[model samples]
Target: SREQTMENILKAAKKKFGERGYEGTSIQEIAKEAKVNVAMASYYFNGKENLYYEVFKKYGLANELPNFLEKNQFNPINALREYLTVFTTHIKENPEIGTLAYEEIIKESARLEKIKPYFIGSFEQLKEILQEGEKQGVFHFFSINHTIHWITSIVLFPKFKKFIDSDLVSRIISALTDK
Candidate 1:
């Protein structure tokens, strides 16, 4: 019952957040969407802030790159190519998460700090991959930090994803690898 309740809360939370964003959404609305009592959302998530964080966790798009990298090893060029593929596809499938994130960042919401670590961790993984590729003479880069941020913008921004596809990945690979 606890598992099901939590799942329901997450489902409702995501839907409400997607539709109205964090500032506009309420626990009561989420509870209504979930068909659970209001207290249940509070009980499971503590409040709106943690509930929003859990929504990100439930959607879990940010985790995909790291998970994919862990399972499959490739040269830096290939790894970066695959990462962009996974990142784009994940965003395409979970547009709501992107909408929610965009809303939060634009508003400079307080909850952004709590969720920042997951993104930072993923960026670190990407940076390490880039470093390895450069060390192996496969990748040429000016600044790893800027490159990572640039690539992250490509992945996180929805309009940019319209240009994403296998062919786009190839171009990205060629551009980043330059070999």
Candidate 2:
């Protein structure tokens, strides 16, 4: 049951922690949601904190974004379209991962250090996307640094459900390229 149980626990972890920040959620509640016994949950994940990190590792954008550039061959302009589309969709699917990292960022927790690498990796891919877009003279934007942060905040911040409901890829690409 190693593989299946781990997924169940991770699923539960994402749901519970996503609804309630890390401090608010408990391992016992997570275990209950996972439909596994408390001890087994602890034994499997070695505790809640570890499970939290595993959630990010499994679902975080950082884990998947590094090779994103390589996957798209042309039109960094159109590439930006694909990137924002999928990136925003990823946030839409598992919003917990998005918000959890925001909590870490705002509070500056120790877990942030563990998850920071994932973010840096993801942002690095974004930088390359913008860089190549700029190189091609297709994507003209303001500062890349703030631009990356803007993309992150725009998509990941769930507080603005209205904004999130729009076509992020279309809007963001237009905002940058004015197309």
Candidate 3:
């Protein structure tokens, strides 16, 4: 039942973190939501921070780039579209992850260093996509850093109005790739 236990912990952790954020969430709350004992959760994760990292992994936040790039075709235009789609989908589905990330990275939470690698990998993916798109003549010239900042800014807009705008994904793709 170890697998199930971890699964339950991750599920509850995701929900709680999404709703309350890292600073606001507690091990007791996660355990209660998972219906598992605090001892078990602590024993398995070693601490609340580890438990949070585990939740990140469970929700594909840790290694989203490689997994998504591997699963999707390498076509630059399509890759950009797919990447943004997946990015927004993850944010929408796991609002806590997005909120937590913003709180940590923008607000200078201590957890930023712990999760920095994951974010670096994500940005690397975007850089690669932009470089590829430019090389293939499918995308307009744009500084990878600026583009990254641009897209990330728009993606993490907090409100779904922009992230889920019917044309949001397509419009970005066109703006970036269609010239």
Q: Which ten residues in a row have the lowest lDDT in candidate 2?
A: 61-70
| lDDT per residue (tens digit) for residues 27-99 in model 3 | 9999999998999999988999999877766665546455444455668777777888878887876667567
Best by lDDT: 2
Candidate 2, residue 69: lDDT:
62
lDDT of each: 0.75, 0.78, 0.77
lDDT of 1: 0.75
Question: TM-scores, in order shown?
Answer: 0.80, 0.85, 0.80
RMSD of each: 3.4, 2.8, 3.3
**Model 3 accuracy (lDDT, Cα):** 0.77
**Sliding window of 10 residues with minimal summed lDDT for model 1:** 62-71
Q: Which model scores highest in TM-score?
A: 2
Predicted structure 3, TM vs. truth: 0.80
lDDT of each residue in 51-134, candidate 2, tens digit only:
888887887766555365667775676667777777777777877856586788755677778878766776677788899988
